[PDB]
Amino acid sequence: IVGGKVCPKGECPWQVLLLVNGAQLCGGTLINTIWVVSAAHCFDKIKNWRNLIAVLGEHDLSEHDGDEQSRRVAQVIIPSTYVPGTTNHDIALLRLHQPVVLTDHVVPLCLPERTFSERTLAFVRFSLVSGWGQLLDRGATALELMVLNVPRLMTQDCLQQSRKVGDSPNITEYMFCAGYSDGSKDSCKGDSGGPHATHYRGTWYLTGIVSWGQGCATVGHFGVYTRVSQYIEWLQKLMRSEPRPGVLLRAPFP
Amino acid sequence: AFLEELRPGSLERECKEEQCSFEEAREIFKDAERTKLFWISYSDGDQCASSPCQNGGSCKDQLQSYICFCLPAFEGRNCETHKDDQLICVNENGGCEQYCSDHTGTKRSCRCHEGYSLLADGVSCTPTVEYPCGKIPILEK
Amino acid sequence: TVAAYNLTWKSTNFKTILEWEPKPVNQVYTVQISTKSGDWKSKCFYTTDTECDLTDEIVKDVKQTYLARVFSYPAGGEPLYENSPEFTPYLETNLGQPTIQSFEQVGTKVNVTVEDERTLVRRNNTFLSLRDVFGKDLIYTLYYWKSSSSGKKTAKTNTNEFLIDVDKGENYCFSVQAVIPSRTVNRKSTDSPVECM
Numbered sequence A: 001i002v003g004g005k006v007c008p009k010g011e012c013p014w015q016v017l018l019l020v021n022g023a024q025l026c027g028g029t030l031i032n033t034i035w036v037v038s039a040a041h042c043f044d045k046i047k048n049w050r051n052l053i054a055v056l057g058e059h060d061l062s063e064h065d066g067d068e069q070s071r072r073v074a075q076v077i078i079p080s081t082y083v084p085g086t087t088n089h090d091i092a093l094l095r096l097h098q099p100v101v102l103t104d105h106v107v108p109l110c111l112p113e114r115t116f117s118e119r120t121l122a123f124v125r126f127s128l129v130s131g132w133g134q135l136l137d138r139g140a141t142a143l144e145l146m147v148l149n150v151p152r153l154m155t156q157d158c159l160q161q162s163r164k165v166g167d168s169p170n171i172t173e174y175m176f177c178a179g180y181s182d183g184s185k186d187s188c189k190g191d192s193g194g195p196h197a198t199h200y201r202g203t204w205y206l207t208g209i210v211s212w213g214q215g216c217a218t219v220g221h222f223g224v225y226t227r228v229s230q231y232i233e234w235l236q237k238l239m240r241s242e243p244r245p246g247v248l249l250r251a252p253f254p
Numbered sequence B: 001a002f003l004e005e006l007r008p009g010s011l012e013r014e015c016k017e018e019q020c021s022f023e024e025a026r027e028i029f030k031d032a033e034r035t036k037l038f039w040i041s042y043s044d045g046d047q048c049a050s051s052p053c054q055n056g057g058s059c060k061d062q063l064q065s066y067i068c069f070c071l072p073a074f075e076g077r078n079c080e081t082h083k084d085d086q087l088i089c090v091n092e093n094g095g096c097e098q099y100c101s102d103h104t105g106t107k108r109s110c111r112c113h114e115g116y117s118l119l120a121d122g123v124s125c126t127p128t129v130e131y132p133c134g135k136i137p138i139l140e141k
Numbered sequence C: 001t002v003a004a005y006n007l008t009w010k011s012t013n014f015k016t017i018l019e020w021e022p023k024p025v026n027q028v029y030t031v032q033i034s035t036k037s038g039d040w041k042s043k044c045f046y047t048t049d050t051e052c053d054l055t056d057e058i059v060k061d062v063k064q065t066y067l068a069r070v071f072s073y074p075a076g077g078e079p080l081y082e083n084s085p086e087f088t089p090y091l092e093t094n095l096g097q098p099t100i101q102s103f104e105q106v107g108t109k110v111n112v113t114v115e116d117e118r119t120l121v122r123r124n125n126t127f128l129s130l131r132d133v134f135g136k137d138l139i140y141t142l143y144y145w146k147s148s149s150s151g152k153k154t155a156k157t158n159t160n161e162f163l164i165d166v167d168k169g170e171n172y173c174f175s176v177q178a179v180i181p182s183r184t185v186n187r188k189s190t191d192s193p194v195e196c197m
């Protein structure tokens, strides 16, 4: 996160830290005791599928405390439509092998219904983005969880206000822009998979996933996020599915 | 009535009580600027004569137009919009705290996410579990 | 669908209506309005009108800067839309036509009173006047003259009243304007109807 603040311990209780072979991989969002939502692109280079861990209650990566809970990732479900190395359909649904225990430091973020997210949450101006990613474009990552408030844009505005970049990726109906084009504040590579959480009448909801952008806090550019409202029915059906022998599942979309 | 034309020039008798032409008013004011000052409003007419303000609203004439002052339950240029007929889910979530469902032929209903239940007011949601989704316990949920 | 165009703000004494083109064919509109950092509020839901009264939203804070947008929806994911110009009611609303409430001769002087100009801004059950809203920013100007004058005289006030010197045995005529001197454009209202002694 560039230009954000340290999220005070326990104030981002749905943030997930994903590890592979014990090394930081990506962020994620807990949505109930068993299921985590992250970005599909986080898994493009995975070879050791049995070495994926989700850590909940994490705050300071340099110190362990009794609020951290680790769980093995049993399943990684990605839309069959997603193409490794590209931006569209950047979402992954992860099944934990055993549920986490809900505490003052570990709480899920609400996955909203589609129509409520489209007609109400989409028009709440600001939402929070968080993670242990880079504090500056191509710089070092963060030791303490960072958080930033970003305003959302309709795609027509995002295209009209962004500096043209030759052959840049299309911003599809499965994405949305949020952030600032003045080079001051944005999410960054290391925050991928993390939540874009929206506060509405006393409850927080999952509206986006940190996905991509042109650099990080680059003048003339906004952060691009996976548009979670497009996947509600897909996620709900998959959360009711039976576990399979292998970890990776490329599930049909829609 | 030619006998009324014997009376001297009067803004009240010629323009106020009866309708006067620009020339008749110009003979009273004499100066071109003073006659324009009078003419711009008097010739403009009263757009409030058609009683455009509905639902108990009040009309105030303006130059080639009017403004309607509405009672609190109404809005619109002519107070035609009934605020009480706008309880739909695209209007501030239909007043629901969490989910809103439109029901054509009847009123909308409010619903809650899993881990919450609807209160007796028909709009508010309360937790049914110790750690409901989307609440931050250290900030006293 | 086709996007709305020629979005124009029509505002007098804070009664504020957004207007646009074209007249809809197999499409309906919804308007949204926000301040630069606030949430978007929807109004005029699925209307076939080419106008939307936004008075109730702008009167929440007349000094804020509002942006509106008109969404086009087909009769049968994000819709086509067009943004309006920015609108700051306090700086841009037209000042309404004033009315001379009364005039009285007090000997060799005349007091001229301007009626309180009603606005669409409410303060619990009552409509605020233009002076309630603008305060020191609002002045009234008076044009006055006798039948045989070589033009007209001007007086200005920080209240709604003028006290002018008059010649004995001369009948005077009056006209008033609401003025926001600090403005550069849309500084004055239209003139009140003329009243004579």
Ligand SMILES: C[C@H](NC(=O)CC(=O)Nc1ccc(C(=N)N)cc1)c1ccc(Oc2cccc(C(=O)O)c2)c(Br)c1
Residues within 6 Å of the ligand: A041, A085, A086, A087, A088, A090, A169, A170, A186, A187, A188, A189, A190, A191, A192, A210, A211, A212, A213, A214, A215, A216, A217, A222, A223, A224
């Ligand atoms: C989805 C995937 N993401 C990543 O790798 C991590 C990443 O970019 N993280 C990040 C998070 C936030 C910000 C931020 N908010 N500034 C920046 C970076 C990604 C994949 C391909 C990309 O480019 C192409 C190239 C060719 C074809 C196409 C094609 O889609 O056709 C797209 C991009 Br660009 C991003």
Ligand SMILES: *[C@H]1O[C@H](CO)[C@@H](O)[C@H](O)[C@H]1O
Residues within 6 Å of the ligand: B046, B047, B048, B049, B050, B051, B052
């Ligand atoms: C009065 O009549 C109609 C409403 O019935 C309105 O359109 C006019 O502008 C007004 O003078």
Ligand SMILES: *[C@@H]1O[C@@H](C)[C@@H](O)[C@@H](O)[C@@H]1O
Residues within 6 Å of the ligand: B056, B057, B058, B059, B069, B070, B071
């Ligand atoms: C004009 O104002 C409206 C709001 C109502 O109070 C009417 O009764 C009045 O004449």
Ligand SMILES: [Ca+2]
Residues within 6 Å of the ligand: A058, A059, A060, A061, A062, A063, A064, A065, A068
């Ligand atoms: Ca730690």
Ligand SMILES: [Ca+2]
Residues within 6 Å of the ligand: B012, B013, B016, B017
């Ligand atoms: Ca008379």
Ligand SMILES: [Ca+2]
Residues within 6 Å of the ligand: B023, B027
């Ligand atoms: Ca003549």
Ligand SMILES: [Ca+2]
Residues within 6 Å of the ligand: B044, B045, B046, B047, B061, B062, B063, B064, B065
């Ligand atoms: Ca008129």
Ligand SMILES: [Cl-]
Residues within 6 Å of the ligand: A070, A071, A072, A096, A097, A098
């Ligand atoms: Cl486990």
Ligand SMILES: [Cl-]
Residues within 6 Å of the ligand: C115, C116, C117, C129, C130, C131, C132, C160
């Ligand atoms: Cl006033």
Ligand SMILES: [Mg+2]
Residues within 6 Å of the ligand: B014, B020, B024
């Ligand atoms: Mg005559």
